[PDB]
Structures are given as structure tokens and as C-alpha cells.
Design a protein around this nucleic acid. Structure first.
Ligand SMILES: Nc1ncnc2c1ncn2[C@@H]1O[C@H](COP(=O)(O)OP(=O)(O)OP(=O)(O)O)[C@@H](O)[C@H]1O
Lengths: 108, 155, 206, 115
RNA sequence: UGAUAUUGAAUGUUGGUACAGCUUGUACAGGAUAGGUAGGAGCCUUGGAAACCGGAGCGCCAGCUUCGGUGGAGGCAUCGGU
């Protein structure tokens, strides 16, 4: 009965409001949340599973830096993987890589 | 285009808040060249922002955009059989463009009756970064981080 | 203390009208057994439990149990037990009950009005019902459909507490995950005949 | 509890395995792209090699290593990422040594793919 | 194929029983890791209190545990609150 209900509700094109503490059932069916917290109802535009596994945004103004710097490390690391150490281009990429790694340490 | 980068277009600062960002959002809200409607919507929204929060509307708006503007986006690249999403840094101008666009679009989808109210609520959510537009920014950052391996690829 | 058989069922038959529910069931519950009684709706799981508890007399068969055995029964009609909570305060040592209650998240149960106590959430009813059963210090636990209305909190509580419990536990549940944490044996009741599987519920499925 | 060890990096075209052993080759710990949940194409990428090296290193640091000798095998692209990742974990890398097996004209290779 | 008789000895490993010792005990608040019950206002103290350090086990990451070395007069409570 639960399996049949799950199949049917995934197809239903109308509005569904479900209360369940079976988070699996919720996570399969629901795409948005109304959370009852601290005597307030807040609407969140995310799945049940994502809301719980969130991580506070206390340093969300800094994650932007950690994201950009790390993505540069990935780009330079990728190129180095394809080039022999004997190519003069290797030297420049390695210096930048070590310098960028220092920045990563400073942000952490 | 192939020739090379093309001259971007300036906007005048809004008469009331003396802000180019406000003016740009007004253009993003405008439909069918009806700039009147969009200016009225925004000014009414900013009154709701000040009347609700009590803080200055501009400060709330600027705080909201900060939470919306993305830093890394993903660009698709067809590498043989499978298509790879390559993470790319977002130019400062593009950050502003995406922020205003995302804000406006998701604001239009909200459930309040009037756009000004809708827009106001959306900006407030972004101020606390819990709205739809915020979620969009989360998604792109997830995609970029997930496909971080392929950053090497690029044009 | 040991694994001495506490409940032994043999040739248990039970019918309603013309519908056979239980047909020739032989099983034993021993000390420390954490048994999941599974099976689809209407298979007789509650009927079986009530016969084990003694609410329903079987048509045939014998139920052997220690004469002094105390059987804590969570039951399904919580409404009746929770309505008697006012009566239970006089019969149960207040202290222990309230100690549990606070853990289950029902804070300051002492102060609740009879209005609220009649208007409870179905999840509150269960939390109050659970606390009551455990304060009675039963030697054998029967938990019909637990974790139905419980939140993350009450599920973590019911798990950590079941593990601690000394006597045997018979859990009637459809919740795969609750079974996959608390039980080591599955009793599958199908076509009025019980089949036995070792381990939790996931392996039972396989 | 041992300090000096060898880091065997097996970088193939499909996966990068990193085993960490003592100087006498007793396995302390190991990690591989597959072990970290990468699948298919992802395991090959040098990014995965980095993560594999880090995970192997952090497992070893419990036993208390400080200096590593690195040996690289196979034609994969992982070696540089895995080596830099080991340095970033804190363990100093004395020397890198390519020990990819080279036959002196031995066994017939498998037939060439017609892709 | 198993039990058992012919059929013995020593060791190691692993369960059950009885005894003894080491000990072991964290909801929240409360000063904090409060196992239950009983008496309970004195107890310990160069026969080493507190405090410092080292060692070790546990641990809910708060912390308690005891072998100890420095250390030398307090330390703990019923009262108080929780
Ligand atoms: N007193 C009764 N009189 C008649 N029929 C009954 C009686 N009790 C149960 N039944 C029926 O016999 C079967 C036994 O139901 P029972 O409550 O024992 O099942 P269950 O395993 O608890 O199911 P569910 O999980 O759906 O509660 C069902 O068909 C039920 O309708």
C-alpha cells in the first residue's frame, strides 16, 4: 500500500501537503518545506533531506573566497597533470600552485 | 561575437536612491518597454522593505543581492560521448546580472497578489537568504563544486 | 539473567467468522529476544499480540508463560490508555514516569490541563503512552506499531531505550528502519502461518 | 607507530590507488578514488588522485608518519596530484621514484583496440 | 555420519555456574558524570587536605577514575538554592 501510494503521488499534478516523520517518504515526495521552528513557520525552497544537512552560513561571506580560490587550484592542478616536468611551462604553474595553496591555508 | 568584446551600455542612477543597481533592477522588471510600471513597483517595494524591517531599504536590498550573486557558474562542454559541466568564475558584471535576473524571476513566482509585495518579500528572504533566488545560487555552487574535477577543461 | 523461554506458543489457532487468522503457530519468546512481527495489513499481527497478552482467548492451543510475568503492552488504542492517565498518576510512581517523559520531549507533563490532555497530538499520545509502559517496569514488552507518530527525538529515545531493556521485546512494525536498528529476528505472518527469519528486517526481505 | 614509510601510488587510466606502507612494505593504510565514491570517469581525473592521497595520508598520520618516499607506477595522470596532496597533508616527501614495470621484451601485449 | 565403551596426558582459546576482588553509574536544572535504599553530623588530615606534574582507563567532549612524583593544612555537609 505504501509503495502504491508513493508511485501515485509522484504522478499527481495537483498540490500535495504531507506531514510525515518518515523522512524517506517525505524526501521522495516533497520539494518544498514549511518548518515549524521556535513558534515560527518559515517556508524553505528545498527538499527535506537538504534542509537537515545544511551547515550554518556563519562564514558564507567567506565560502565565496574558498570556492573561487579552490576552483583555481583545480584548473592549475588539471593542467600540470598533462605536462612533463621538463616543459618550461611547468615552473610557472608550480609556483602559482604553491602560492595559491598558501592562500587556501590562510582562509581556513 | 568573433571580432571581440563589444561596448556595454551604461544606465543612469535612480533619481531617488542615486543607485545604478536600483536602476538596473527597474529595467529587469520592465515589460513591453513600460518603464513607468516597473519604477512604481520598485519604489512601492522599497517602502514595504523600510516599513517592514525598519532598516533602510537600500541596505536591505544590497544585503540581499550579496547573498544572491554567484561566484562560480558552470558551462556545458560536449566531450566525446558525455557532456561535461565546466565550472567557470563569474565576471563581476555577470554576478550583478545574474543576481537581478534571478531575484526578479523568482519574485514573479511567489504567491503574494501584487508584484511590489512579492518583490518585497523576495528581497527580505534574500536578506535572510532563505528564498527561492538564494536556492538557485546554492544549486549553481553545488554544480560547480561537484564538477570541480573538470575545471581544467575550458575554451 | 539468562535466555529461559518466557513465552511459548504451540498450536495457536484463531478464527473470526469464517476467516482463519492464525493457523497452527508454534514459536517461543526467550529472554533478550528482539523480535519483529511483520506482515501486511490484516495478517493478524495485532490479533496475535492480543492473544499473547491475553486480551483474546484462542480457539485452540496453549500459551505457556510464567504465572507472575508482567507484560507491558503498547497496544493500538492508545486513546483508552491516555484517557486513563489521570488515573495512572495515582497507581504509578510519579518520579520514574516523569523522568522518562521529559526525555521523550513531553516537558512539564504535571502542568497540562485536562483539556490539553484530551486534545493531545497523536505523537504526544504515543510519547505519553510509551513513558507509562516503561515506568511500570514490565518484564516483557509488546510494542504494537511504535514510531508511527514519533519525531527524530522519540525515535532516538525508543531505540536507545529498547537496547537497554532487559526483557524480551516483540515489535509489530512496518517501519523498515526502526526494525533495522532494534530487532534480530523477524516473524513474518502470511496466509495465517508464521515463518521465521534470522537477523533484522532488511535481510528478512532478501 | 612508525615514522618513515613508502607511498605506493598506482595511477592507471581508470583509477588511482594510494597505499602507504612502512619502509619494510607492511601496509599501514591505503585509499583509492573508488573508495572515496568516485565512479567511472571521475576516478581517473587528477582531482580524484588528490583526494585519494589525502585520505590515505590522514589514515597514516594516526600511526605517526613524518617522512615519505614516493613510488609511482602506471601511466595514469594522478601521480602529480597525489604527490602534491601528500605534501599538503604535512608529510614531507623525500624522493619520488617512477617504478612503472618495464618488460625487457617479455609477454605479447593484448591486441590493439579498433576504436 | 554422530553418541558412547575400548580411551590416556599436557597446553592454549572460548562460553555457563558459584564466590571474591577491581571497580562501574552523565536526561534537564543544580556549583557538576546525582545508580537505588538506610543512618547521618561530624569525617579525613606528617598514617599527608588542597594545589602542581607525570601515567593510565573511560568518556555524552562536560569531564569522573585510580598507580603515582611536587605539595604542605585544610577539604568535604547536613544549612543555602536547585
Ligand atoms: N474482533 C474481530 N472480529 C472480526 N474480524 C476481526 C477481528 N479482529 C480482527 N479481525 C479481522 O481479522 C484480521 C486480523 O486483523 P488484525 O488487526 O489482527 O491485523 P494486523 O496484523 O494488526 O493488521 P494492521 O497492521 O492493518 O493493523 C483482519 O482481517 C481484521 O479485519
Amino acid at each position: 500500500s505504501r509503495e502504491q501510494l508513493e508511485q501515485t503521488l509522484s504522478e499527481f499534478t495537483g498540490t500535495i501537503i504531507t506531514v510525515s516523520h518518515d523522512h524517506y517518504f517525505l524526501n521522495k515526495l516533497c520539494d518544498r518545506l514549511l518548518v515549524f521552528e521556535n513558534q515560527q513557520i518559515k517556508r524553505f525552497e528545498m527538499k527535506p533531506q537538504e534542509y537537515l544537512n545544511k551547515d550554518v552560513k556563519s562564514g558564507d561571506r567567506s565560502e565565496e573566497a574558498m570556492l573561487i580560490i579552490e576552483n583555481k587550484i583545480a584548473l592549475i592542478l588539471g593542467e600540470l597533470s598533462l605536462i612533463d616536468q621538463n616543459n618550461p611551462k611547468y615552473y610557472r604553474l608550480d609556483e602559482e600552485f604553491n602560492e595559491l595553496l598558501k592562500q587556501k591555508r590562510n582562509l581556513k | 561575437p568573433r571580432k571581440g568584446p563589444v561596448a556595454k551600455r551604461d544606465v543612469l542612477p535612480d533619481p531617488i536612491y542615486n543607485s545604478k543597481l536600483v536602476s538596473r533592477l527597474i529595467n529587469k522588471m520592465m515589460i513591453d518597454g513600460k518603464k513607468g510600471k516597473s519604477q512604481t513597483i520598485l519604489y512601492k517595494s522599497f517602502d514595504i522593505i523600510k516599513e517592514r524591517t525598519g532598516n533602510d531599504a537600500m541596505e536591505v536590498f544590497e544585503q540581499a543581492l550579496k547573498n544572491i550573486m554567484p561566484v562560480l557558474e558552470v558551462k556545458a562542454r560536449r566531450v566525446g560521448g558525455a557532456n561535461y559541466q565546466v565550472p567557470v568564475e563569474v565576471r563581476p558584471e555577470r554576478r550583478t546580472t545574474l543576481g537581478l535576473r534571478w531575484l526578479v524571476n523568482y519574485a514573479r513566482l511567489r504567491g503574494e497578489k501584487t508584484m511590489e509585495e512579492r518583490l518585497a518579500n523576495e528581497i527580505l528572504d534574500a536578506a535572510n537568504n532563505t528564498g527561492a533566488a538564494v536556492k538557485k545560487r546554492e544549486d549553481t555552487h553545488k554544480m560547480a563544486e561537484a564538477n570541480k574535477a573538470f575545471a581544467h577543461y575550458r575554451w | 539473567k539468562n535466555q529461559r523461554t518466557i513465552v511459548k506458543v504451540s498450536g495457536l489457532e484463531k478464527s473470526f467468522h469464517l476467516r482463519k487468522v492464525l493457523q497452527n503457530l508454534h514459536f517461543e519468546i526467550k529472554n533478550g529476544d528482539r523480535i519483529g512481527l511483520v506482515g501486511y495489513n490484516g495478517t493478524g499481527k495485532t490479533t496475535l499480540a492480543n492473544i499473547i497478552f491475553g486480551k483474546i482467548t484462542p480457539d485452540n492451543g496453549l500459551i505457556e508463560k510464567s504465572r507472575d510475568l508482567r507484560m507491558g503492552y503498547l497496544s493500538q488504542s492508545i486513546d483508552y490508555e491516555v484517557s486513563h492517565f489521570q488515573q495512572s498518576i495515582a497507581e504509578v510512581e510519579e518520579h520514574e514516569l516523569f523522568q522518562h517523559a521529559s526525555s521523550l520531549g513531553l516537558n512539564k507533563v504535571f502542568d497540562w490541563s485536562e483539556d490539553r490532555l484530551t486534545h493531545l497530538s497523536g505523537g504526544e499520545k504515543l510519547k505519553l503512552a510509551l513513558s507509562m509502559v516503561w515506568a511500570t517496569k514490565p518484564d516483557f514488552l509488546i510494542l504494537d506499531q511504535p514510531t508511527n507518530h514519533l519525531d527524530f527525538t522519540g525515535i532516538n529515545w525508543l531505540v536507545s531505550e529498547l537496547e537497554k531493556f532487559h526483557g524480551p521485546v516483540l515489535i509489530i512494525s512496518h517501519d523498515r528502519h526502526f526494525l533495522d536498528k532494534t530487532v534480530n529476528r523477524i516473524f513474518e505472518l502470511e496466509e495465517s502461518r508464521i515463518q521465521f527469519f534470522n537477523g533484522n528486517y532488511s535481510d528478512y526481505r532478501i | 607507530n612508525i615514522e618513515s614509510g613508502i607511498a605506493h601510488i598506482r595511477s592507471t587510466f581508470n583509477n588511482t590507488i594510494v597505499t602507504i606502507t612502512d619502509t619494510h612494505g607492511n601496509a599501514i593504510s591505503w585509499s583509492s578514488a573508488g573508495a572515496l565514491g568516485f565512479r567511472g570517469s571521475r576516478k581517473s581525473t587528477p582531482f580524484a588522485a588528490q583526494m585519494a592521497a589525502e585520505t590515505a595520508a590522514k589514515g597514516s598520520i594516526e600511526h605517526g608518519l613524518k617522512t615519505l618516499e614516493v613510488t609511482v607506477k602506471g601511466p595514469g595522470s594522478g601521480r602529480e596530484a597525489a604527490i602534491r596532496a601528500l605534501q599538503a597533508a604535512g608529510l614531507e616527501v623525500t624522493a619520488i621514484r617512477d617504478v612503472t614495470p618495464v618488460p625487457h621484451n617479455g609477454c605479447r601485449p593484448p591486441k590493439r583496440r579498433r576504436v
